[PDB]
Structure 1
Amino acid sequence: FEASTIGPAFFTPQVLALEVDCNIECASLLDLYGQIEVSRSTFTY
């Protein structure tokens, strides 16, 4: 029963516990800006 003459169904592959992830996100400046809290869609100053 040479592997070259039988179906893949008999050979279950190993499952690695890794996950390639190439995505990145650039640093944010949000901490510099001034923080304001509101409770309505419109405001005045």
Structure 2
Amino acid sequence: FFTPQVLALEVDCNIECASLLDLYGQIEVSRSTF
């Protein structure tokens, strides 16, 4: 009989670490074994 007020927050509490992927040299590649 009592409908709770569904509030609109969503706690996450989950860290990533650190993308160290912009320092490295990137090269678009093609069919494998370059």
User: TM tier, shorter chain?
Assistant: 0.7 to 0.9
Structure (1/2) with the larger strand percentage: 1
- Structure 1's unaligned 5+ residue stretches are 1-9
Give the greater-gyration-radius structure (CA): 1
- Report the number of matched residues: 34
* Partner Cα distance (1:29, 1:12) in 2: 47
Over aligned residue pairs, what C-alpha RMSD do you find? Answer: 0.9
Q: TM-score, normalised by structure 1?
A: 0.64
Which consecutive unaligned segments of at least 5 residues does structure 2 have?
Answer: none
List, as ranges, runs of 4+ consecutive aligned residues in structure 1 with deviation greater than 3 Å.
none
TM-score by length of structure 2 reads: 0.76
Identical-pair percentage = 100
